[PDB]
Amino acid sequence: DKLLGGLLASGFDEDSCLSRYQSVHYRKPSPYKPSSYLISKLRNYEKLHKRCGPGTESYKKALKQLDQDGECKYVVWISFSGLGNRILSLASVFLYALLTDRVLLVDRGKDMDDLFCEPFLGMSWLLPLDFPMTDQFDGLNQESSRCYGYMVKNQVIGTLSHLYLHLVHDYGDHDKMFFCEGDQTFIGKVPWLIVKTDNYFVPSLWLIPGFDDELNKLFPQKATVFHHLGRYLFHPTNQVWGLVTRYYEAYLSHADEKIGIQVRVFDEDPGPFQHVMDQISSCTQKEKLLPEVDTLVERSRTPKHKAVLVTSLNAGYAENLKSMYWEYPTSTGEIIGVHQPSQEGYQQKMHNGKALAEMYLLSLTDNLVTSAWSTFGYVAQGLGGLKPWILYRPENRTTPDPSCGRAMSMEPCFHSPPFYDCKAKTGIDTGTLVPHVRHCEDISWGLKLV
């Protein structure tokens, strides 16, 4: 099923985006099926987009409104921050567009169209380069005159022609009013919304009345939001897809089982660090993801091949594993090969291409280990429909104990959620209101769907 149970629309040009349908030959089928209601929501979204998208008459008339009522409403996502952040925040803004009957338009930035194919059949999701507010995207912040929070603060609130929503991690109490029901009703009248964020803000949408009922219908399995919208939205270009297929076929395709180890060390020193090496071997072995080796001369008595796919900025962790499985027999007899695609040293177009391909490769494994706080790993696990084991975030360069725990769900984590009761107008722990929105396993104040 190259259509993912109805999630994807047929009729795309194969050759211009090989990954779209051809990736069926590379993963196992997801056991999570999209709701019939979500499928209808997306087919109808594509009709709205054909009706209102760039190049249409309707879109031209709506531009003239920004400048000088209407039947077209929009939300523009600004390109900003690292790739993991961009994939997650873009999926969030898309969900928000579905909840508000808006058209999503994508600021291409430097490379989004170099990485990702078109997701909406017959139109394009890219904001035209001549959109007349493009020169202001960089400057837009909490002090912008059309920043919603800045307008609340100054108490400046007819209907505005447009509104900027500051949803970056450094946002304040006024910006956070975005997550309140009364504020959403006001914002819903504004034709043009511009969003900047580096967070996966999905979970808090489930706490806004009105949205909650719609979300219930869209995702009866509440923790499939990113798994469905992410696989629907993001398809690597042929350039990026080449890195995926060539690495898969050369190094991973002959394995009975594949284990992804997504290694991310939030430290200015590049390492590698012995305590992280120790965390990894500790985790994979105590969870029976990888076998022990032993030093007995007398051996006991066809073996499965396991490929270990390690992604990191530094290759020391994979080299450590490689050596160990080369130097010693496994206690179970299994055959273990360790593979790492790259060692880029730090974040830096070939670099973004490689990072996307590596997230994609991780999403092709059978069992996945990820690193606490890493959105690199959230993307991999979401696209793969994979519930990882999480390597907890170490303090004072001490190997955490326990070294890892299983995730509650495959969902990404919202790192900077609001902690606000809109009704009582006072603070509250938003991770203790409903059973399906809980604090994240890797970051105690984050939120995620379960």
Ligand X SMILES: OC[C@H]1O[C@@H](O[C@H]2[C@@H](OC[C@H]3O[C@@H](O[C@H]4[C@H](O)[C@@H](O)[C@H](O[C@H]5[C@H](O)[C@@H](O)[C@H](O)O[C@@H]5CO)O[C@@H]4CO[C@H]4OC[C@@H](O)[C@H](O)[C@H]4O[C@@H]4O[C@H](CO)[C@H](O)[C@H](O)[C@H]4O)[C@H](O)[C@@H](O)[C@@H]3O[C@@H]3O[C@H](CO[C@H]4OC[C@@H](O)[C@H](O)[C@H]4O)[C@@H](O)[C@H](O)[C@H]3O)OC[C@@H](O)[C@@H]2O)[C@H](O)[C@@H](O)[C@H]1O
Using CB under 8 A, which residues numbered 322 to 351 contact a second copy? 323, 325-327, 329, 335-337, 341-343, 350
Greatest Cα pair distance, the chain, in angstroms, is 85
Give the strand pairing for 74-77 and 103-106. Answer: parallel
Hey, CA dihedral for 406, 411, 415, 421, is it positive or negative?
negative
Give the interface segment with ligand GDP, choosing from 153-161, 227-235, 240-248, 340-348 (CB under 6 A).
340-348
Residue in 30, 184, 279, 312 binding ligand GDP, rule: CB under 6 A: 312
Distance CA 427, CA 445 (A): 14
Angle in degrees, 0-180, between the axes of helices 36-52 and 57-67, rounded to the nearest 10: 70
**Pairwise CA distance, residues 372 & 190, whole Å:** 38
User: Looking at beta carbons, which residue is closest to ligand GDP?
Assistant: 82
Q: Can you tell me the distance from the alpha carbon of 443 to that of 247, in angstroms, rounded to the nearest whole number?
A: 32
Query: Could you tell me which stretch among 80-88, 169-177, 289-297, 400-408 binds ligand GDP (CB under 6 A)?
Result: 80-88
Q: Rounded to 5 degrees, what are φ and ψ at 161?
A: -80, -25
416 near ligand GDP, judged by CB under 6 A? no
Beta partners for residue 368, in sequence order? 260
Q: Tell me the C-alpha to C-alpha distance, in Å, between residue 278 and each of 87, 150, 283, 397, 404.
A: 31, 48, 8, 11, 11
Nearest residue to 356 (alpha-carbon basis) of 15, 126, 118, 87:
87
Q: Cβ closer to a second copy: 96 or 241?
A: 241
Whole-number Å distance between alpha carbons of 223 and 228: 10
Residue 150, token pair as written in the block:
């800045």
- To Cl ion, the closest distance from the beta carbon of 359 in angstroms equals 27
The Cβ of residue 355 has, within 10 Å, a number of other Cβ atoms equal to 25
For residue 236, the minimal CB distance to ligand X (Å) is 21
Alpha-carbon radius of gyration of the chain? 23
Does residue 246 interact with a second copy by CB under 8 A?
Answer: yes
Instruction: Report the residue from 197, 375, 399, 403 that binds ligand X according to the rule CB under 6 A.
Output: 375
- Does the protein bind a second copy through residue 243 (CB under 8 A)? yes
Least distance from ligand GDP to the Cβ atom of residue 358, Å = 5
Q: Is 273 in the site for Cl ion (CB under 5 A)?
A: yes
Q: Per rule CB under 6 A, is residue 82 in the interface with ligand GDP?
A: yes
Whose tokens are 């160990």? That residue is 324
Binding residues with ligand GDP: total (CB under 6 A): 17
Please tell me whether the peptide bond between 54 and the residue prior to it is cis, using omega within 30 degrees of 0.
no
**Window of 282-290, 332-340, 381-389, 417-425 that interacts with ligand X by CB under 6 A:** 417-425
φ/ψ of 420, rounded to 5, equals: -135, 135
By CB under 6 A, residue 358 contacts ligand GDP: yes
Strands 437-439 and 447-449: antiparallel
User: CA–CA separation, 381 vs 385, rounded Å?
Assistant: 6
Q: Least distance from C-beta 20 to ligand X, angstroms?
A: 28
Residue 83 binding target from Cl ion, a second copy, ligand GDP, none, CB below 5 to 8 Å by type: ligand GDP
56 vs 446: CA distance, rounded Å: 41
Is residue 274 part of the contact set for Cl ion (CB under 5 A)? yes
Q: Least CB distance from residue 88 to ligand GDP, whole Å? A: 8
Region from 26-34, 163-171, 234-242, 410-418 binding a second copy, contact rule CB under 8 A: 234-242
* Listed ranges 40-48, 205-213, 278-286, 350-358: which one lies at the site for ligand GDP (CB under 6 A): 350-358
Residues 137-176: x/- map of binding to ligand X (CB under 6 A)? --------------------------------x-------
Residue placing its CB nearer to a second copy in the complex, 25 or 64: 25
| Interface ranges with Cl ion (CB under 5 A) | 273-274
| Interface ranges with a second copy (CB under 8 A) | 238-239, 242-243, 246-247, 249-251, 254, 297, 303, 305, 319, 323, 325-327, 329, 335-337, 341-343, 350
